[PDB]
């Protein structure tokens, strides 16, 4: 039990005469606050609010020469309740609408005073970081989202952020299986943004999310396309007696309206047509013009006619195919 008393006296010695107000090496070179992240999971991507909920094992290791011990050849890992008694980087996430550290069972948090002095401080954080969504190519979009770590009150003179490990500082991203997204790539940047007061440190973790078209091609595009095909069926019916053709044509726009109404619930209200509303409206225009084609041919016949029928029949599939080709080419790239 001698080691128990030794650890007790050493911890008491360390925490005695410790000023939380003073950063490590105050009045000296900047303290190199290395960082390390391990994304546990990306819970969801809220495009309506333009933000994503991310849960990560945020960690930040720095050196504090005061918290230096040599007698015990081991790495103490004190209770998480001691963090309030030690200096900590005043880190904040610039784009952070809402976040909290998990509390069950005890406050999820770590301290580990290594023998040299390196303090491995880590928290289990859930963040609803903000991410400006340019949903103009949606659903064929490549939304880019970032987390912006930055010190609040300290300038680059006093503090300095770096990824301990050039790229290994971020881990667990590959195993993440987003529901509607695929994390094509992630990059880590270490800038020094210059503000009015001075140059502040900055680390910008970035994820280049790619929308999973496999889900939405059947969820949204497939019904609309299928209904468009049904519109083509109208032309086959007849011209001598087309009272059925009018009914078949006019039902399709109602189907379109129902599909659109259900779709609008999930989407935001960005004014640009996006890749989705443009296609839905174009299909709406095509079916509407099919109804107008029926109107014109019916008026002319009751007012040569066979040629009008057949020319319309050939014209509609080819021009719709051109529309589909143009749209896919424009938005796929």
């Amino acid at each position: 039990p001698s080691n128990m008393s030794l650890v007790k006296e050493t911890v008491d010695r360390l925490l005695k005469g410790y000023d939380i107000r003073l950063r490590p090496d105050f009045g000296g070179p900047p303290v190199a606050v290395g960082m390390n992240i391990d994304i546990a999971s990306i819970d969801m991507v809220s495009e309506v609010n333009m933000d994503y909920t991310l849960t990560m094992y945020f960690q930040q290791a720095w050196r504090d020469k005061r918290l230096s011990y040599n007698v015990i050849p081991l790495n103490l890992t004190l209770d998480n309740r001691v963090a309030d008694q030690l200096w900590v980087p005043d880190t904040y996430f610039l784009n952070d609408k809402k976040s909290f550290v998990h509390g069950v069972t005890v406050k999820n948090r770590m301290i580990r005073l290594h023998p040299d002095g390196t303090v491995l401080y880590g928290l289990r954080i859930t963040t609803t970081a903000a991410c400006m969504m340019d949903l103009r190519r949606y659903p064929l979009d490549e939304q880019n989202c970032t987390l912006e770590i930055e010190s609040y009150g300290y300038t680059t003179d006093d503090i300095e952020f770096y990824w301990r490990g050039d790229d290994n500082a971020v881990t667990g991203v590959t195993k993440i299986e987003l529901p509607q997204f695929s994390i094509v790539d992630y990059k880590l940047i270490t800038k020094k943004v210059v503000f009015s007061t001075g140059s502040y440190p900055r680390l910008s973790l970035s994820f280049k999310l790619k929308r999973n078209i496999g889900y939405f091609i059947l969820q949204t595009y497939m019904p609309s396309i299928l209904i468009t095909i049904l519109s083509w069926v109208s032309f086959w019916i007849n011209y001598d007696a087309s009272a059925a053709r009018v009914a078949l044509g006019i039902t399709t726009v109602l189907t379109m309206t129902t599909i659109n109404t259900h779709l609008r619930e999930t989407l935001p209200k960005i004014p640009y047509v996006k890749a989705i509303d443009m296609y839905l409206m174009g299909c709406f225009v095509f079916v509407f013009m099919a109804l107008l084609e029926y109107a014109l041919v019916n008026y002319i016949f009751f007012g040569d006619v066979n040629a009008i029928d057949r020319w319309s029949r050939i014209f509609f599939p080819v021009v719709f195919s051109f529309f589909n080709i143009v749209y896919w080419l424009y938005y796929v790239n």
């Binding site: 000023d19 003073l22 105050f26 009045g27």
Partner: peptide, 30 residues
């Protein structure tokens, strides 16, 4: 020695300060 001066200044700042009253109460607007 720089820290000693700094920490002594921080110690002496709050001495005699009563946060219940705004600066210059009864003398001028804050």
């Amino acid at each position: 020695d720089n820290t000693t001066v700094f920490t002594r200044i921080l110690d002496r700042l709050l001495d005699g300060y009563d946060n219940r009253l705004r600066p210059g109460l009864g003398e001028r607007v804050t």
